[PDB]
Amino acid sequence: QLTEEQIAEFKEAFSLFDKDGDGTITTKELGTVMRSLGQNPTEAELQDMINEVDADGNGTIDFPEFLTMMSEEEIREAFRVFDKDGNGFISAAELRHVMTNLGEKLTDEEVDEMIREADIDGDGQVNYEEFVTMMTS
Amino acid sequence: GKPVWAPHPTDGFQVGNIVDIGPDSLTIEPLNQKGKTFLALINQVFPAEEDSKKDVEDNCSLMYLNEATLLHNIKVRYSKDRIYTYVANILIAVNPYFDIPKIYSSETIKSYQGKSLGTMPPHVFAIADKAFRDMKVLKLSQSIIVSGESGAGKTENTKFVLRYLTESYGTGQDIDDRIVEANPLLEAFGNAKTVRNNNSSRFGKFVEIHFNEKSSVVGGFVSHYLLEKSRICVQGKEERNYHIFYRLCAGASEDIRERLHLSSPDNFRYLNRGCTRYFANKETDKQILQNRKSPEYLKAGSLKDPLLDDHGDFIRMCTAMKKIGLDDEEKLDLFRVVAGVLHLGNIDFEEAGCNLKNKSTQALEYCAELLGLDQDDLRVSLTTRVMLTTAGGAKGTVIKVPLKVEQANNARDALAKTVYSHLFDHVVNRVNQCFPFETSSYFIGVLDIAGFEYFEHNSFEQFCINYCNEKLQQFFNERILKEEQELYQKEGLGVNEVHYVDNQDCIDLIEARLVGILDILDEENRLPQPSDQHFTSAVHQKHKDHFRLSIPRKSKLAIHRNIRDDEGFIIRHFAGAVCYETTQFVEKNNDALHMSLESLICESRDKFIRELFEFISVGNKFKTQLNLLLDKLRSTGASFIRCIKPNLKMTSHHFEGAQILSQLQCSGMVSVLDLMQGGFPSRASFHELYNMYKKYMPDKLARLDPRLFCKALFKALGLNEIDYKFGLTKVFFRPGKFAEFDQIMKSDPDHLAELVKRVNHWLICSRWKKVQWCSLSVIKLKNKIKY
Ligand SMILES: [Ca+2]
Ligand SMILES: [Ca+2]
Ligand SMILES: [Ca+2]
Ligand SMILES: [Ca+2]
């Protein structure tokens, strides 16, 4: 169903959900990350989505279960979470907003450096095409 | 030229340096004397943790997981009163010998409910809760298998498990309090003084909390196995029969003493080859009438124990009988059978086949009255047996066959063992009637059974116990092997066979059909002139080149040297070689009760005795019962606790190193450490690795989350993919490789700084990809709610 590459990439995404690092996402944790990225799912939608994939039945989501639980419009809407005002471009101040909502700790020197290494044309910001190229390496 | 552990006679290991090498040895200079250099075998020297003050909750966090670093880690933790430590999911538990504040409180109980092993400090409660959660989720009954010497905190440990389970997951019924109240009864009939332990359990006890479909407590059940029958009739010096015999002789009123014709223990064959003295102190000694005390008691004084006391334990035993509903009639019924068995043992015989000696006439009278038998019927069934005139189908006649003297002794003792064992079965069933239940879906059970043991002289009793433990050790190893393989798959480590050297061959040596030691012992009985020496040569002949069998001459000890090839054998058990002297193996392999005599006791005048009752060797009966125990354990999920007795003086804050090292070996912990060396014995959470090594990294990397920090570090360093495995929650290491990783982080800072600078691209990428695929993941979760 998924390529080797993409399984590895989702494994790193999974750790973003799993903050305490116990190898498992609770309901509380799953909400924290969706809500931090601008979404408003409810306590029953989360719990019912979890129960339909909780194969071992232990009230909790391991990585295998997270995989099944998971169409360029998804990719484009992914970009639109970084693009608050939506000029089609992600600034250093906007990336800093999604980073710190997500829980990532860094200074603006660091934020600026990230934006630069992904910014192929050198205009100080990150457009959608340059956003996809990273994902795929 | 780094520190190692090397043998020390009382601490187990001591820290030292290797200053010279030899063919199979190393020369060690101790740190703590510097020039009392000594020799040590190479397999007795182990690498040492650099930080001698470090302690870890899970010994798998060590850079070297071996018996010396384990010993030291639990020493350091014991000094800080942390008596609990894991090896992966195994719990090591050192008896504090004092009441630790707060760790057993209702609040602590609550804090362990639901929590994964590894998210709380080590604790017996985490083992109980893991058993609970697996039972509920997997719909599978659970075992908790506790090893340890008698008095190593096992009793207390069991109480903590039962208390945890009833208070957390029960509804007001205090089942664990009912088992504790019954204890003095069980111990009276099933415990005894041994050479090493005043209060040793001589049966396998498996205490079950039963649960309904809703995973709520409904009742209890004590399963019992393998009561040691040989103790009933004879004991070595320094050992006693079961406590009941001494509690009754020391504590019974004069009225009961006259009704059961009791007297001091030196007057009974079944007591007087062993230690005939009571456990008493200055005060309780004054409460035992002089006519209860043996010549050796009056001469040498009482046995000493801080808890056991035969007069006091008698009273406490009668109180325990009242609490489980036993009226004064059933209590005297128990005592009557006990005295019956004692008088049974004083009946002697003489070459007429044979006859009751004239001096034994009153023993017969007393035995017969107490067991509700006609004096004459008993006399005849002890000295004769019936037999059919044919064997293979043809119509036959009943004949009377007289017994030789030694066969009469055997029927007498056979009848004693059967009566006593059935009485024990009755006592345990009576305990179980204090917390019955119609139905249950599953149980959580705690196992207590005598561990692996050796002495200067090891007979058939030791052989059986060590055989029992050889099989339990295989079970322990199979399940750890499986837990580890499952952990590695769960963590994404990929394809990994772990090298497992099975001990099935030692088990086959003992128990295999026809060719095993037990079947060869059975075969000895069949020969015209059975001999211990013929049995022993037959073992050596049939297994001439078996890896686990040696003749006694091959021993590494001095004292086994003059033992002939036909007087003994060595078995290379999981915990070490044991030399067995085989004298008496043949007679100890027989305790059959011939049928006329068994039928006689079944139809005792007395109803209580008839109720107790309503061609296989001792070795094979042992095997059979052992296999029922294993059948039960194999049908459950298993967890393991290793109880350790820190010293022989019941004193707190006194870690006796070599004694604890010995228990770690005999309890199979060392064997499990060897097994884990074939897998990934060292592991550390990203969070632990982050905190150890962030001080060496630029602030850039020190700001990353622990997992990405470790990913960046491991990529940057170019680590060999065979030795280092980056899991989901932890980094896993082959033997020695966490130490090697540590050296890379410490040995060349300029190299490390350049390697880190060069990973800057890959890290910036991985940090985008991480957050990119995370927003993509939050999108897909929104879309699945939209379904
Ligand atoms: Ca988690
Ligand atoms: Ca799950
Ligand atoms: Ca924008
Ligand atoms: Ca750009």
CA of B445 to the centre of ligand 1 (A): 30
Spatial distance between the Cα atoms of B465 and A13, rounded to a whole number of angstroms: 53
Facing residue for B700 by CB, picked from A30, A82, A110: A110
Q: Spell out the SS3 assignment of B600-629.
A: HHHCCCCHHHHHHCCCCCHHHHHHHHHHHH
**Nearest chain A residue to B778, by CA:** A34
SS3 B147: strand
φ and ψ of B519, to 5 deg? -75, -30
Check whether residue A40 and residue A86 sit in a common domain. Answer: no
Check whether residue A66 and residue A76 sit in a common domain. Answer: no
Tokens of B212: 């309904």
Alpha helices in B400-457 (DSSP H): 405-432
From A70, A95, A128, the end of a domain falls on A70
CATH number for position A99: 1.10.238.10
Total number of residues shown for chain A: 137
Residue B704's CB is within 10 A of a number of other CB atoms, namely: 22
Spatial distance between the Cα atoms of B743 and B775, rounded to a whole number of angstroms: 38
B175-179, Cβ contacts within 8 angstroms, sequence gap of 24 or more: B175/B209, B175/B217, B175/B219, B175/B220, B175/B435, B176/B220, B178/B220, B178/B434, B178/B435, B179/B207, B179/B220, B179/B222, B179/B431, B179/B435
Q: How far is CA B511 from each of CA A67, B450, B619, rounded to the nearest angstrom?
A: 49, 19, 9
φ and ψ of A7, to 5 deg? -65, -45
Cα Rg of chain B, angstroms = 31
With DSSP H G I counted as helix, E B as strand and the rest as coil, what are the percentages for chain B, rounded to 5? Answer: 50, 15, 35
Cβ pair B770, B708 in contact under 8 A: yes
From A19, A46, A70, the end of a domain falls on A70
Query: Which residues 37-76 on chain A approach chain B with CB closer than 8 angstroms?
Result: 37, 39, 41, 45, 49, 56-58, 62-63, 69-70, 74-75
Number of domains in chain A: 2
Q: Smallest Cα–Cα separation from B670: which of B54, B13, B3, B9?
A: B13
φ and ψ of B657, to 5 deg? -55, -55
Tokens of A66: 């997270």
**Nearest chain A residue to B765, by CA:** A134
**What type of residue sits at position B299?**
K
Tokens of B182: 């019954």
Question: In a 10 Å sphere around its CB, with 0-12 CB exposed, 13-18 middle and 19+ buried, how is residue B749 labelled?
Answer: exposed
Tokens of B757: 């600078």
Check whether residue A61 and residue A120 sit in a common domain. Answer: no
In chain B, count H helices and then E strands: 31, 24
**What does B546-576 look like in DSSP terms, one character per residue?**
-TTEE-GGG-SSSTTTT--TTSEEEEE-SS-
Spatial distance between the Cα atoms of A41 and A66, rounded to a whole number of angstroms: 17
Spatial distance between the Cα atoms of B338 and B262, rounded to a whole number of angstroms: 10
Nearest CA to CA, how far is A86 from chain B (Å)?
A: 16
Cβ pair B344, B412 in contact under 8 A: yes
From A70, A92, A112, the end of a domain falls on A70
Measure CA B454 to chain center.
Answer: 14
Facing residue for A21 by CB, picked from B133, B706, B768: B706
Check whether residue A62 and residue A11 sit in a common domain. Answer: yes
Spatial distance between the Cα atoms of B203 and B639, rounded to a whole number of angstroms: 21
Spatial distance between the Cα atoms of A31 and A40, rounded to a whole number of angstroms: 9
Cβ pair B406, B103 in contact under 8 A: no
Q: How was this structure determined?
A: X-ray
SS3 B103: coil
- Which residue matches tokens 């920090």? B709
**Nearest chain B residue to A70, by CA:** B780
Tokens of B751: 């190299």
Q: Is B424 on the interface with A (CB under 8 A)?
A: no
Nearest CA to CA, how far is B134 from chain A (Å)?
A: 9
Using the 8-state DSSP alphabet, how is residue B433 labeled?
A: T
Residues forming beta bridges with residue B46, ordered by sequence position: B5
Q: Mutate which of A104, A113, A128 to disrupt the B interface (most B C-beta within 10 Å)?
A: A104
Cβ pair B731, B713 in contact under 8 A: no
Spatial distance between the Cα atoms of B135 and B141, rounded to a whole number of angstroms: 6
Question: In a 10 Å sphere around its CB, with 0-12 CB exposed, 13-18 middle and 19+ buried, how is residue B624 labelled?
Answer: exposed
CA of A30 to the centre of ligand 1 (A): 9
Q: How far is CA A120 from each of CA A125, A129, A137, B28, rounded to the nearest angstrom?
A: 10, 10, 14, 63
Kindly identify the ligand whose nearest atom is closest to the C-alpha of A86: 3
Check whether residue A63 and residue A26 sit in a common domain. Answer: yes
Spatial distance between the Cα atoms of A135 and B564, rounded to a whole number of angstroms: 77
Query: Which residues 47-86 on chain B approach chain A with CB closer than 8 angstroms?
Result: none
**What does chain A look like in DSSP terms, one character per residue?**
---HHHHHHHHHHHHHH-SS-SS-B-HHHHHHHHHHTS----HHHHHHHHHTT-SS-SSSB-HHHHHHH--HHHHHHHHHHH-SS-SSEE-HHHHHHHHHHHT----HHHHHHHHHHH-SS-SSSEEHHHHHHHHH-
What domain range is A18 assigned to?
A: 3-70
Chain B residue numbers touching A11 (CB-CB < 8 A): 492, 728
Cβ pair B540, B569 in contact under 8 A: yes
SS3 B316: helix
Check whether residue A128 and residue A106 sit in a common domain. Answer: yes
Spatial distance between the Cα atoms of B419 and B119, rounded to a whole number of angstroms: 51
**What type of residue sits at position A2?**
L
The domain spans of chain B are 1-679, 680-787
Spatial distance between the Cα atoms of B463 and B483, rounded to a whole number of angstroms: 30
SS3 B292: helix
Kindly identify the ligand whose nearest atom is closest to the C-alpha of A89: 3
Q: Smallest Cα–Cα separation from B30: which of B3, B70, B59?
A: B3
Spatial distance between the Cα atoms of B338 and B232, rounded to a whole number of angstroms: 11
CA of A52 to the centre of ligand 3 (A): 37
In chain B, which residues are last before a break of more than 2.5 Å from C to the next N?
A: 352, 614
Spatial distance between the Cα atoms of B664 and B644, rounded to a whole number of angstroms: 8
Chain B residue numbers touching A114 (CB-CB < 8 A): 764, 767-768
